[PDB]
């Protein structure tokens, strides 16, 4: 069966088609309102930017999180926003990913050869490490219930300090943990190592996300970013 807690987590998941179409609609108006005069890396910054907006709106209306004061909500989101972008990216490839291509949040499918030629050494290396996580999570049969659990484990991080209500974050971290432990037992009893193999991806996701953060900030300092959007603001703080 499914622990009641995991059911409550699922009821906070947005309708994936609605957020994809919404982001696609946004980017279509951006370029449509551009002239024929006047990149791809920039086109991803804005895709990742709009994905951040949906991530914020998801957490905002999510159980437990909606009971935190705004100061606490900001500390949690400031700590994990990059992790959620990566985790969201990884899960999209597990679900829709085909070998040799990237599925974007707008639903578009892009060939690797096109991305690899432009991304650069660092981003290529970070994307490849993410694909290794994709292959692993696909071989474990990473499903939606396990996905939302990891989302909340990333969100309610014990690494976040100076919270007014750290006890709530601690409890959510623990009850989500116990629920995932019980979910993988009932629904995947043969996989004695599934639970552990899912948790071991969170530090790997963290490391990729922090490295991605540092690199994008480098590109911002270097002058290679559309300026002042939400993406840049999260990098500042």
């Amino acid at each position: 069966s499914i622990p009641h807690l995991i059911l409550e987590l699922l009821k906070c998941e947005p309708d994936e088609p609605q957020v994809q179409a919404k982001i696609m609609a946004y980017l279509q108006q951006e370029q449509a309102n551009r002239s024929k005069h006047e990149s791809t890396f920039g086109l991803m910054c804005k895709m990742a930017d709009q994905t951040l907006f949906s991530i914020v709106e998801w957490a905002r209306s999510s159980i437990f999180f909606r009971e935190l004061k705004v100061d606490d909500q900001m500390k949690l989101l400031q700590n994990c926003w990059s992790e959620l972008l990566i985790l969201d990216h990884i899960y999209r490839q597990v679900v829709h990913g085909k070998e040799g291509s990237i599925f974007l949040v707008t639903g578009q499918q892009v060939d690797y050869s096109i991305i690899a030629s432009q991304a650069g050494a660092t981003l290529n290396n970070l994307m490849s490490h993410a694909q290794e996580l994709v292959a692993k999570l696909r071989s474990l049969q990473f499903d939606q219930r396990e996905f939302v659990c990891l989302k909340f484990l990333v969100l309610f991080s014990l690494d976040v300090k100076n919270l007014e209500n750290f006890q709530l974050v601690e409890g959510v971290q623990e009850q989500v943990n116990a629920a995932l432990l019980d979910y993988t037992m009932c629904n995947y009893p043969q996989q004695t190592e599934k639970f552990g193999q899912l948790l071991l991806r969170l530090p790997e996701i963290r490391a990729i996300s922090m490295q991605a953060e540092e690199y994008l900030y480098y590109k911002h300092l270097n002058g290679d970013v559309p300026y002042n959007n939400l993406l840049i603001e999260m990098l500042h703080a």
Binding site: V56, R60, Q73, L230, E233
Partner: peptide, 11 residues
């Protein structure tokens, strides 16, 4: 982070 607080406060 002015924009983040806005996204959490806006109605």
């Amino acid at each position: 982070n002015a924009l983040l607080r806005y996204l959490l406060d806006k109605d």
